[PDB]
Design a binder for this molecule. Structure first.
Ligand SMILES: [Zn+2]
Lengths: 1084, 132, 185
C-alpha cells in the first residue's frame, strides 16, 4: 500500500513508480482514487497502442513541454573548396601515446556560415518544421518558392512578388522549430593541459570527444601558426564549461546549470522567452484541489498531497482573455451548421439522463386515470382521449432532457415547440381534442428558451376562441385568427398583450383572465454560480464570469418538500392552467353541440390532473440547477448564454454577430453567418407531448440520499475531465490568432500598428485570396508544429482573413447593442517572429538573400576583387551623372539605313543602345524575349551596362580557379534566358578562390556584380595557413566571438539586433511533470 | 527516449498491515460503468467545419441538406425511425439562413472554375515566345 | 445537386445506357433516380384530376427528400385486421375500442362495440391522411414534410406505394443526382 493516496497495489517492488507521481523518489495523465470504494480510475493518452483498464483522452492536447539534449544552435559552418596544407606540428605526444589535433572549425580554402536549424540536436517529439539550407554552391531556391508558386510558368524559379511572404513564412518556421526546453545532462571533469580543471558537458550517445572539439574552440592549443591558432590565442581560457550550478540537489546531480558552449544568441533568446512563458504559466496542486472542491458544489471534497519541490511543472494557469477568444472561435466555427451542434446536445442529454435521480414513469398517469371511465351509451369520452393523446405507453422522453441541455446554449441554438403540436387548423374551443392540445401546449411552453413563448401561449387561446370572443386589432391586416406559430419575433407582440386594460372584460372575459394569468404567474428567471473562477478561467461572456442564467428560478435543495407546494412556480402554473380551463368549461357557453353534459367529467379529470404525485417540478426547482452547474465547467464546449427576459420586449435579443475589424476603421460591412437567423440562434424543434408527460409523471427512488447519490455520480465524471487539455488548446489558439493577425498585417495593407522591420523585400498588396492562402499555410504550419489534428483558426479563413481584432456583440429589440471586445495580451510567437525579423534585416546574407541590386556589364579584368564586394568605380547610383532611368513606357525602334536603334527614356527622350542605364526588374520580366533578343547581343561585346534594381534576390555562388581563363557569359546568358514573367532564377555570381602561395594572373570576364556589400556569411578564408596573400582577405570574425575576445565583457552581454553571437551562455534545466492526482473524499 | 508523432508533417520483518483488504462490498447506485460511458461519449471534441476554407493550393476545399442530415443522425441516435427532436421543417421560417458553402471564394466570386485554373489562364494569357 | 433531363431515367437500364453521353454530356459521381413508376402514376391520376394541377404539384415536389406512401384498408377491414391480429393496434386509438378489439366472441350483436364502430373515424389514429378528396398540392406537401404519408385511395402521386395490411383486406444521394422531372422547391 501507499501511505500518501491510499492506493492499494499488489506489487511491492514498483511502489517507487507510483510515489514518483506524488513527487517522491525511490505516459500517464491523471490518477483519481475514491475514498469509499476500491476502484481507481486512470486517464491515458488517446493514441496509445493498447488499453488495459484505462480511459482515453479524446482531445488534441498540444505538446507544450519538449526537451533538447544536443546543442542550442542553428548556424553551422560548412567548408567549400577544401584544401590541405603541410603542418609543422602533427599531433600531441604524452608518454608512449599520441592524440590527433582536432580543429573546432573546418579546414578549407573558403568556409562560410549557413543556417541549418537543429543540426546537432537530440530531442524527443521533434517539432519537424525544420528549415534546410544547402551550401551556397548548390541551389537554394527551393524554399523561396514554397508558398505561392503552384502555378508558376517555370520550375527552378521564384516569384519576386511573393518573396516577402515566403521569407515571412520561413522566419515563422524557423521560430516554430525552436520551442524546446534545454535538458541538463552529465558532465565530465577534464584534465587537458589547455583546459585543466574545467567541467565539460557530454552529450548522450556513443562517444563525445568529437562533440567536445566542436563545442569548445578553446580546447585546441596553439601547436601550429595559423588563423585558427591566432584566434584561439586571442581567446581567453578562463570562461569555458560550467559557469555555476544550482543549490537544490536530488542526489548528486545538480538542479539547473548554465554552461559556456557553442550556441547562437537568437535561439537561446527564443528558448528563454519560451521558458519564461511556461514558468509564468505553471500551476501547483493545492489550488487545483481548491478548484475541484469548488466545482464539486460542496457535495464532494477533494485533496491532493505533494512533497515540497521546486522543479515541479504543470502549465495550466491562463487568463480569461484566452478563454473568451477560444469561445469566440468555437462559436464562429458553427456557421449555421445543424450537424456540428446536434451531437453535443444529443449526448449531453443522455449524460443528464444517467446523472439525474428523477426517473420518468407515465404509469402514474395511467393509474390516476384508470378509475375514470364512461358509460356504454355515450360516444365521446374525455378520459379515453386524454390517454390516447398523452400516450402513456411511449418511453421516448429525450426531448425534456434536450430542453434542459439547451437551457445552457441560447445564442447559438434556441429550443421551440415543434409545429404540428399546435391545434389542427385554426382550432376551436368546441372540440375536446383541440382543448387538450391547448392544455398540453400551454403546460409545455414555459420550459422552452423561446422569448415569444408567452405570446404563443396567449395567441393559441385567442385563435381557439375566435368566433366566441373578440379582441381589438390595430392595422386591420392581421386578423385575430392568425396562427400562433407565426409569432416568433418580438416585433409581433400585440398591444392587447402588452397592455391588459385594452382587453375589455365585458366582451373577452376568458381571454382577459388568461392574459392576466400569463402576466402574473409566468416563471421568473434567476442565476446560479458554477465552476471556479480563480484557478480555471471562465469562457462565458455577456454575463459576469461566475453565474449561470436559468429561465427557471432555483431554491436550496431538500427532498422533504410537499408535492403540492403551490409556492413552487411550476406547480402554481399547472394549477392555474387547470383552474382557468375548468372555468372555461363550466358554463358550456363555448361548447355548443355537446348533447351530453360533459362538465362533470371534464372538471373531475381536470382536478385529477391539477393534483397528482409528480416530483418533476420539485426536481427542476432544486436538483436540476445543481447538476447543470456541476457539469457546466467540464464540457468540451463551455456554455454560451444570453440574458433572459420575460414579458419585456425591449431587452429581448434578436441577433448575434462576430466582427473581425477594429473600432477606429470604416471598413466594408461583412456580417457573420450567425446573424442570418429569424431567432437569436439555430432553431430546434421540440415535441410538446414528451415534455408535458415528463413534467406530469416523475418519481424519486424510495430510499434516495442526495449526498451519497451525488458523491457516487460526480467521481466517475471528474475522473474523465479534459479541462486542462482544453486550457492548453485555448492558449495555443490565442497564440495562433495573434501570430496570424501580425503576419497578415505585415504583407497586406491594414491599420494594425506593428513595427515593419522588413519592407525592402519586393512584394504586392495581397488580395483576399492571397491573404486566405497565406493564412491557410500559417495555420497548417502551426498545426504541424504543435501536433493538433482538430480545428484551429479555420473559421477565420472563411471570408476576409485581413482581420484586426475579434469581438462578439448581440443586439436587443430597441437597438442598444452590447459589444464585448476581449483585450489580447502580448503573445510569444508574434514577438519572437518580430525579433527574428529584426535580426534578419541586419543578417540577411546568412539565410541566403542579398540586399541591394545587380549590375550587368562586361568587366575584362585580371584583378581578384570579389564581385560581392566590388570597388566603387564599377557601380553607378541614381545620382551618377550621365545615366538614363527607364519607366514602363519604354519603346524600342529600329534604325533605318544603318542607324543606331534607340529606346525611349522615361523622360521622353530617345537614347542609343550604349551607356549606363538604370532599369527596374519589372520591365525585363515584362519584355523578356525582346529585351533579351536585342540586349543579349548588345551587352556581350558592346558598352551597354544595365543596373537591374530589385531590392532582394537569392544568389548562388560559383568558384573558379583564379589562375585559369574563365568566362561568366555562359551563366549570365543562362540567367537572362529563363527570367519568365512569373519567376526568376537565383542570380549566379562567379567569385574567385583565396590562395596562400603566389599564383599566376589569368584574365576573367565578369558580367554580374552586386551594388553593395553582400558577403557577410564568409566565416574565414584559408583557415589553415598563417596568412592569405592572393584573393579576398578574411580572418576569423572576432565580432561574433565576443565574450572570449572582449576582456571587459560580462557573460550575459549580447548584441541581439546587430550581429548574432556564437558561444553564448545557455542555461539547462531538469523539470518533473507529475500526473494530476486527487483523493476523492466524501461529504456526510 | 522518444515519443511517436501523431500527425505527419514535412513528409519527404515486513508484514501485511491489517487495513488492506479487497472486498468490493459496495455497488454504485448511479452506475460507474453507465456514467463512465456517458461521459466518454460527452467528452468528444466538437466536429470540425472545414467547408468554404482554402487549402495549400488556394482552392476552396468545401463541397459544392444539413438540417435533414442532422435529423437523420438524431433518428439514428434514437431507436425509433421517427424523430422527436428535429432541426428541419420546424415552424420558424428561416429562409434567410446561409451556410459556409464551397461555391464562393474569399473574394466573393463563384468557384465555377478553381482559383488555380483561373490564375493559370490569367498568367498564360500573355506569355512571350522565341522568334521564328 | 439535382439535374432534370427530358427522358425516362431508371436505375439500372438508365445507368447502363447513361443518356449523358446520349445528350452530349461527358460524365461513381452521378446517381440515377427512377421515375417509370411516377410516369405511370401521372397517367393513372390524370383521369380524376386536371393535368395543370398535377404538374404544378409535382414540380413543387422535391426529389432529394426520401418518403413513402402507405395505403390503409377501408374502415371495416382495418377494424377487422386489427381484431384478428391485435398486437398491431396503435396506442393512439382509444382505450375502449382497443380493449374491446382485444376480446373474443365479437360479432354484430354487440351494442356499444357498434356504437364505437360508427362513432370511429380515422382522423386521430393516422394523422397525415390523404383522403379521396385531398388536392394534389396537399399530398405533395405532406410527402416533403414527413417520411411516411398515409392514404386511403390508390390514386396518388409521389414516392412509392406500400400496403399496410395483408392483400385480402384491400378490395443513394451522390454528389450529382439526375432525374426527369424538374423541381423548383
Ligand atoms: Zn500513492
Amino acid at each position: 500500500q501507499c501511505h500518501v493516496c491510499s492506493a492499494v497495489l499488489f506489487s511491492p517492488l514498483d511502489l517507487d513508480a507510483h510515489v514518483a507521481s506524488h513527487g517522491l523518489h525511490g505516459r500517464h495523465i491523471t490518477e483519481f482514487i475514491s475514498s469509499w470504494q476500491n476502484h481507481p480510475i486512470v486517464q491515458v493518452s488517446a493514441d496509445v497502442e493498447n488499453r488495459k483498464t484505462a480511459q482515453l483522452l479524446h482531445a488534441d492536447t498540444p505538446r507544450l513541454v519538449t526537451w533538447d539534449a544536443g546543442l542550442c544552435t542553428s548556424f553551422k559552418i560548412v567548408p567549400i573548396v577544401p584544401a590541405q596544407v603541410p603542418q609543422d606540428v602533427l599531433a600531441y605526444t604524452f608518454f608512449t601515446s599520441s592524440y590527433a589535433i582536432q580543429s573546432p572549425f573546418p579546414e578549407a580554402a573558403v568556409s562560410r556560415i549557413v543556417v541549418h536549424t537543429r543540426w546537432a540536436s537530440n530531442v524527443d517529439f521533434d517539432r519537424d518544421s525544420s528549415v534546410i539550407m544547402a551550401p551556397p554552391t548548390e541551389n537554394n531556391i527551393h524554399l523561396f518558392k514554397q508558398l505561392l508558386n503552384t502555378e508558376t510558368l517555370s520550375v527552378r524559379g521564384a516569384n519576386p512578388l511573393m518573396f516577402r511572404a515566403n521569407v515571412l513564412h520561413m522566419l515563422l518556421e524557423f521560430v516554430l522549430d525552436n520551442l524546446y526546453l534545454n535538458r541538463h545532462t552529465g558532465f565530465s571533469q577534464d584534465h587537458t593541459p589547455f583546459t585543466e580543471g574545467a567541467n565539460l558537458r557530454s552529450l548522450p550517445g556513443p562517444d563525445a570527444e568529437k562533440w567536445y572539439s566542436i563545442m569548445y574552440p578553446t580546447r585546441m592549443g596553439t601547436p601550429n601558426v595559423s588563423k585558427i591558432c591566432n584566434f584561439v590565442a586571442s581567446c581567453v581560457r578562463n570562461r569555458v564549461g560550467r559557469f555555476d550550478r544550482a543549490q537544490m540537489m536530488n542526489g548528486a546531480m545538480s538542479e539547473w546549470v548554465d554552461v559556456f558552449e557553442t550556441s547562437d544568441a537568437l535561439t537561446v533568446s527564443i528558448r528563454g522567452r519560451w521558458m519564461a512563458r511556461l514558468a509564468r504559466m505553471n500551476i501547483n496542486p493545492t489550488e487545483i484541489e481548491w478548484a475541484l472542491t469548488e466545482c464539486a458544489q460542496g457535495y464532494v471534497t477533494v485533496t491532493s498531497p505533494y512533497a515540497p519541490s521546486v522543479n515541479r511543472l504543470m502549465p495550466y494557469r491562463i487568463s480569461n482573455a484566452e478563454r473568451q477568444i477560444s469561445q469566440i472561435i468555437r462559436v464562429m466555427n458553427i456557421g449555421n451548421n445543424a450537424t456540428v451542434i446536434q451531437p453535443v446536445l444529443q449526448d449531453i442529454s443522455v449524460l443528464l439522463q444517467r446523472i439525474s435521480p428523477l426517473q420518468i414513469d407515465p404509469t402514474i398517469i395511467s393509474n390516476t386515470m384508470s378509475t375514470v371511465s364512461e358509460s356504454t351509451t355515450q360516444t365521446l369520452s374525455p378520459a379515453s382521449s386524454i390517454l390516447g393523446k398523452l400516450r402513456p405507453s411511449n418511453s421516448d422522453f429525450s426531448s425534456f432532457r434536450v430542453a434542459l441541455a439547451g437551457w445552457l446554449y441560447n445564442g447559438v441554438v434556441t429550443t421551440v415547440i415543434d409545429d404540428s403540436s399546435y391545434p389542427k387548423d385554426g382550432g376551436s374551443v368546441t372540440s375536446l381534442e383541440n382543448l387538450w392540445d391547448f392544455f398540453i401546449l400551454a403546460l409545455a411552453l414555459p420550459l422552452t428558451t423561446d422569448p415569444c413563448a408567452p405570446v404563443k401561449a396567449f395567441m393559441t387561446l385567442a385563435n381557439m376562441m375566435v368566433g366566441f370572443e373578440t379582441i381589438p386589432m390595430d392595422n386591420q391586416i392581421y386578423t385575430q385568427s392568425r396562427r400562433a406559430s407565426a409569432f416568433s419575433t418580438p416585433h409581433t407582440w400585440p398591444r392587447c398583450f402588452m397592455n391588459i386594460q385594452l382587453i375589455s372584460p365585458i366582451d373577452a372575459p376568458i381571454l382577459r383572465q388568461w392574459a392576466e394569468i400569463i402576466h402574473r404567474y409566468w416563471p421568473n428567471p434567476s442565476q446560479i454560480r458554477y465552476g471556479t473562477p480563480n484557478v480555471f478561467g471562465s469562457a462565458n461572456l455577456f454575463t459576469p464570469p461566475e453565474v449561470l442564467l436559468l429561465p427557471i428560478d432555483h431554491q436550496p435543495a431538500n427532498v422533504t418538500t410537499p408535492t403540492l407546494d403551490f409556492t413552487n412556480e411550476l406547480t402554481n402554473w399547472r394549477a392555474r392552467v387547470c383552474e382557468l380551463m375548468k372555468n372555461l368549461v363550466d358554463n358550456q357557453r363555448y361548447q355548443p353541440g355537446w348533447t351530453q353534459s360533459l362538465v362533470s367529467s371534464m372538471r373531475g379529470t381536470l382536478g385529477k390532473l391539477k393534483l397528482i404525485k409528480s416530483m418533476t417540478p420539485m426536481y427542476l426547482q432544486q436538483l436540476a440547477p445543481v447538476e447543470l452547474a456541476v457539469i457546466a465547467p467540464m464540457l468540451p464546449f463551455p456554455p454560451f448564454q444570453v440574458p433572459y427576459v420575460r414579458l419585456d420586449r425591449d431587452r429581448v435579443p434578436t441577433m448575434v454577430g462576430v466582427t473581425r475589424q477594429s473600432r477606429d476603421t470604416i471598413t466594408q460591412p461583412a456580417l457573420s453567418l450567425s446573424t442570418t437567423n429569424t431567432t437569436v440562434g439555430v432553431p430546434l424543434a421540440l415535441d410538446a407531448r414528451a415534455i408535458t408527460v415528463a413534467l406530469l409523471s416523475g418519481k424519486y427512488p424510495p430510499d434516495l440520499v442526495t449526498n451519497v447519490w451525488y458523491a457516487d455520480a460526480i467521481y466517475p465524471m471528474y475522473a474523465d475531465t479534459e479541462v486542462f487539455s482544453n486550457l492548453q488548446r485555448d492558449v495555443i489558439t490565442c497564440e495562433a490568432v495573434q501570430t496570424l493577425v501580425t503576419l497578415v498585417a505585415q504583407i497586406s495593407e491594414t491599420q494594425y500598428p506593428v513595427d515593419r522591420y522588413l519592407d525592402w523585400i519586393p512584394s504586392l498588396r495581397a488580395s483576399a485570396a492571397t491573404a486566405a492562402t497565406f493564412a491557410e499555410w500559417v495555420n497548417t504550419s502551426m498545426k504541424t508544429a504543435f501536433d493538433l489534428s482538430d480545428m484551429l483558426l479555420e473559421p477565420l479563413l472563411s471570408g476576409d482573413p485581413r482581420m484586426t481584432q475579434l469581438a462578439i456583440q448581440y443586439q436587443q429589440y430597441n437597438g442598444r447593442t452590447f459589444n464585448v471586445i476581449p483585450e489580447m495580451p502580448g503573445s510569444v510567437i508574434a514577438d519572437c517572429v518580430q525579433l527574428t525579423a529584426e535580426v534578419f534585416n541586419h543578417e540577411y546574407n546568412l539565410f541566403g538573400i542579398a540586399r541591394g541590386d545587380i549590375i550587368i556589364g562586361r568587366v575584362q579584368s585580371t584583378h581578384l576583387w570579389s564581385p560581392l564586394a566590388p570597388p566603387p568605380d564599377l557601380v553607378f547610383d541614381r545620382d551618377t551623372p550621365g545615366v538614363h532611368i527607364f519607366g514602363r513606357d519604354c519603346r524600342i525602334s529600329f534604325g533605318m539605313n544603318g542607324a543606331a536603334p534607340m529606346i525611349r527614356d522615361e523622360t521622353g527622350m530617345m537614347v542609343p543602345f550604349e551607356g549606363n542605364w538604370i532599369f527596374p526588374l519589372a520591365l525585363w520580366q515584362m519584355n523578356t524575349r525582346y529585351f533579351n533578343q536585342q540586349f543579349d547581343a548588345w551587352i556581350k561585346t558592346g558598352e551597354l551596362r544595365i543596373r537591374i534594381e530589385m531590392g532582394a534576390y537569392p544568389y548562388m555562388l560559383h568558384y573558379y580557379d583564379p589562375r585559369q581563363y574563365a568566362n561568366a557569359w555562359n551563366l549570365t546568358s543562362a540567367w537572362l534566358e529563363e527570367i519568365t514573367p512569373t519567376s526568376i532564377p537565383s542570380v549566379p555570381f562567379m567569385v574567385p578562390i583565396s590562395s596562400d602561395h603566389d599564383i599566376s594572373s589569368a584574365p576573367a570576364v565578369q558580367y554580374i556584380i552586386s551594388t553593395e556589400y553582400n558577403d557577410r556569411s564568409l566565416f574565414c578564408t584559408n583557415s589553415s595557413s598563417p596568412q592569405t596573400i592572393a584573393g579576398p582577405d578574411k580572418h576569423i570574425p572576432v565580432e561574433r566571438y565576443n565574450i572570449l575576445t572582449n576582456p571587459d565583457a560580462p557573460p550575459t552581454q549580447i548584441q541581439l539586433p546587430e550581429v548574432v553571437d556564437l558561444y553564448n551562455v545557455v542555461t539547462r534545466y531538469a523539470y518533473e511533470t507529475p500526473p494530476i492526482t486527487a483523493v476523492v473524499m466524501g461529504v456526510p | 527516449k522518444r515519443i511517436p508523432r501523431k500527425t505527419k508533417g514535412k513528409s519527404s520483518p515486513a508484514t501485511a498491515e491489517p487495513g488492506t483488504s479487497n472486498c468490493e462490498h459496495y455497488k454504485a447506485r448511479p452506475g460507474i460503468a453507465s456514467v463512465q460511458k456517458a461521459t466518454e461519449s460527452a467528452e468528444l471534441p466538437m466536429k470540425n467545419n472545414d467547408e468554404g476554407t482554402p487549402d495549400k493550393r488556394g482552392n476552396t476545399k468545401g463541397a459544392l441538406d444539413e438540417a435533414d442530415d442532422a435529423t437523420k443522425k438524431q433518428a439514428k441516435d434514437t431507436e425509433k425511425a421517427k424523430a422527436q427532436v428535429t432541426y428541419s421543417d420546424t415552424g420558424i421560417n428561416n429562409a434567410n439562413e446561409l451556410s459556409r458553402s464551397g461555391n464562393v471564394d474569399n473574394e466573393g466570386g463563384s468557384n465555377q472554375k478553381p482559383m488555380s485554373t483561373r490564375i493559370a489562364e490569367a498568367t498564360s494569357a500573355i506569355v512571350s515566345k522565341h522568334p521564328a | 445537386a439535382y439535374i432534370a433531363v427530358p427522358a425516362v431515367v431508371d436505375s439500372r437500364s438508365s445507368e447502363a445506357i447513361g443518356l449523358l453521353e446520349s445528350f452530349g454530356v461527358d460524365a461513381n459521381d452521378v446517381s440515377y433516380q427512377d421515375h417509370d413508376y411516377v410516369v405511370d402514376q401521372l397517367q393513372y391520376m390524370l383521369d380524376g384530376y386536371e393535368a395543370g394541377d398535377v404538374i404544378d404539384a409535382l414540380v413543387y415536389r422535391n426529389w432529394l427528400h426520401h418518403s413513402v406512401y402507405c395505403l390503409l384498408p377501408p374502415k371495416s377491414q382495418l377494424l377487422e385486421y386489427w381484431k384478428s391480429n391485435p398486437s398491431v393496434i396503435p396506442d393512439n386509438v382509444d382505450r375502449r375500442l382497443r380493449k374491446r378489439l382485444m376480446l373474443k366472441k365479437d360479432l354484430r350483436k354487440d351494442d356499444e362495440y357498434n356504437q364505437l364502430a360508427r362513432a370511429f373515424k380515422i382522423s386521430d389514429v393516422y394523422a397525415p391522411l390523404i383522403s379521396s378528396t385531398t388536392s394534389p398540392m396537399t399530398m405533395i406537401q405532406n410527402l416533403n414534410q414527413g417520411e411516411i404519408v398515409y392514404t386511403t385511395t390508390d390514386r396518388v402521386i409521389g414516392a412509392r406505394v406500400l400496403l399496410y395490411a395483408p392483400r385480402k383486406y384491400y378490395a443513394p444521394h451522390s454528389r450529382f443526382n439526375v432525374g426527369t422531372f424538374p423541381s423548383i422547391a
